[model samples]
Target: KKLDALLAMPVKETKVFVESNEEPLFVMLKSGGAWMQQLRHQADQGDAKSAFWLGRFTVEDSRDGKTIDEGIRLIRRSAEGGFVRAQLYLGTLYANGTHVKADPHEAEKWLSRAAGQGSPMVQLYLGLMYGHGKGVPRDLNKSLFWVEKAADRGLPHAQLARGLFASFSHYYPRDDEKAVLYLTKAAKQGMPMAQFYLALMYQRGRGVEQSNEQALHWNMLAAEQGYPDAEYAMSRMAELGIGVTADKAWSMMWLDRAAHHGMPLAQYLMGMAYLEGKSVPQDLPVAAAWFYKAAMQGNADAQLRLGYMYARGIGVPVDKPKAVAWLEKAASAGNTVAGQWLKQLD
Candidate 1:
């Protein structure tokens, strides 16, 4: 479920899209179905837009890797043929070392071309490259300039990112007013992270008036979009009666969601709940399992609990060596109780 929503969007039925091509696009293909066959036929006749559509289309590709293999090559062909989206794909592939060697320099050149058509989103990528000084030298002015260009066009992601940077970044001035401005724009566009940030800003009275109701409103919106942090935020708000009537049942339900969604602190707390049989019935094996999940994420308390569970074989199989390892991690992470326990022999 952590990766549910990606790559499932249907191909455009609009028949034509304009990125950087002169000829109209042919996107009405379920493809096999050419509509993909037509795209293949069109691509065979040296149609860059057809090649691009075929190249970028990622369904539950049930075919053997041969046709999909050509998708990689066609992407490059479309990129060279001046398809900005294809160029962006090739750039990000190299940028993230996906199916190719990571090369920052190579990414920069193609990404530059991707933005050559006055693109907004590609400009955002350029902003990150200069801001973090990864592919190029650190240039704060250039970074801000590129992102602002994208933000000016009302791209929610750029606005959200620019808002985040304005809050606490070395590259930009700490301007809460600007942060709220951009965050509000992005939040209204249904960006969950922007919603979460706006919730915090509203709660803290940073750039906006303090209002628990506003915090609750924005955070609830974020939680509905499967943001784990927002679920945890809702749990606390319910427990503390921040903006609504206190409801223990509501708090536990959201807390359960946060724990299952892989919030480490919630996992640790879940371990305790199962261990103590307070909210949940006694289930040592379940508690041990929860502690393991949290321990893997570097929660010191969970590490300490897991080490003892292994050492004593309380909820899991007794294994001194496994116990020593987790105790070491817990001690290393500044858990005094774990450190003190580490002094004794396994």
Candidate 2:
């Protein structure tokens, strides 16, 4: 019944999206289905510009992992339909290997497609690709050209990329001020990464005034979206009583929340908390659970601790094979320390 009603709503749709509890405002208008300028040129009702944005909201809402795949499909369809925005999203999907195969080549292809369309986002990312050589060969001149194009086009992401390349290029003068300028633009556009980093710049007075209020404001903006890094910053603020009043318990609470949401570092921290009973009650079983979870996700520190637990039967029954399996997985994920330990076990 709910699905039917939702589907029964008008097919062509648009909506203004904004986050609450902030001084400055950032808004994005979502266009999907039959409500796009692209629809006027061609009919690909499944183009998914709307659905892709909707899926972004869905992911933010904590939908199951399967829903991320659905979002990827939507973005892929739009990209296939020659939509530049969709192409950009496809690149993200490819980079994250979320709901799609991880192929840097494929990621580059979609990003290049968007760049060719003169999208500031694509241009910025393309420049990063060149600067960092993620999915493309390193080309300093090309990176500058693409990043500058994106900056000129008024893309905040492009602005950030341009700043990154400028800082690294000896031939071009480094401009931290330019970096702040572009990042601030992207930050105002509601980009969480930008907001988080911009908060750092503000807090450190790096090419910007040292303003705790501004830093906290940007941090909160990013935190509302629940980005792990942003959450960590908020947790620190609550811990140190910086900008906001001190609230250790509240700080721990946010840390716990982020841990449950799959932040490996948070999981490790939670395990440590359990180990010491610092803020949370000591519960070896719960600690072991979090440690195991993080270990499974290839956290080297967690893997070593989980192995110790098995060796001593602290929180779980002793199982050599299980401990070995966890250690192996952690090693495979590129933990040099875990790799050394595993070799000793063998």
Candidate 3:
């Protein structure tokens, strides 16, 4: 909707040098095109600790070619010199396989070294590694322990995990009550997924008294942050006046935003909205465009709607082959209506 404002970004070089009170310049970037910045690090800074760290920062920004090799070498040197952050940087590089073959062993080694020194973010990741058995043996007790430690350190994801694991795990007796406890803690800190789940709990009276008003409040906050499921729920609330006044126009707005963000159910709803001229005027062209976009992304209902548009020459020229192709794709994706149409055409 703010396309013009976004497009108005000056296509001028933007200086991005490091600003600090205690650290030297370790990162720099120049604006590229209209919407991007190009990062380039000075790689000839020799074997100084901060210089090596600067190389690591460059590797993080540009993880390919000579920059990558130089960055890895300098980061290794920095890590060997007992730089905790250098070890963490190299660990991330190994974990993501940015420029070298992914080596979990190396990742674990460096990550463990940094994690042991009391890095909250590193502790969270270490907890995740232990939790998921990545580069280490799976240990749920260890996972919970580290996660709890990280949570106490105020790590949001760790706080979330304490609740999510307690809620979803069948390994122990279900504990919705405890789950709600930690989830509420994390949700208050603005975790979108936590907010969405907590809203559901509030909506359904699970471990908490049902409160549609509270549910709507949380759901709207999450939706505003671009969570499609929350956006869908808010759309329904807007449409049906659940804990809020009915406003089809606002409902359609959320539905369109959700559909644009790749929600299959929202895509179907968008098609129906246009067909019925509800909230928005009947515009087959825009409807067909949205359906086509979602259809290409593998939404069965979208594919069926796109096929119908082509078959009926609604927004585009009538093309039988295109219709059949889209219908076949939808049918293959388990759309019974498309299956019927495909068989009828066959």
For all predicted structures, in order, the TM-scores are 0.68, 0.58, 0.65
* Clash tally for model 3: 0
| Candidate-wise lDDT, in order | 0.74, 0.66, 0.69
lDDT assessment of candidate 1: 0.74
| Tens digits of per-residue lDDT for model 3, 1-346 | 3223212322222111101121110110000242222222332433446656566666777846887777678788778777787788778777777677668788778877878776676786776666666564556676667767787778777777676666555432356787787778889999987787778777777678888888888888888999887887888878778788999888877887888778766776676666546466877777787777778767677787778667667677898899999988888877777777667666
- What would the per-residue lDDT of candidate 2 be over residues 73-131, giving only the tens digit for each residue? 65666678777777877776776676676787787778778788955765766765665
Supply every candidate's count of residue pairs whose N, Cα or C atoms clash at under 3 angstroms.
3, 1, 0
Stretches of candidate 2 exceeding 4 Å from the true structure: 1-117, 125-138, 163-175, 325-346
**Pairwise lDDT winner, candidates 2 and 3:** 3
Q: Model 3 — which ten-residue stretch has the worst lDDT?
A: 22-31
lDDT of 1 by residue, 1-346 (tens): 3111111212112110001121111110010682778778887777888888888774125365666667878888888888887888888787777667878878777877877675787787687676666655567787777777888799987888777777756546788888888888999999987898878788778788888999889889998988877887887788778889888789877779979999887787678777776676878888889989999998787788888778777678898899989999989988777876678753
Clashing pairs in 2: 32-50
Model 3 ranges with Cα > 4 A deviation = 1-113, 166-174, 260-264, 278-280
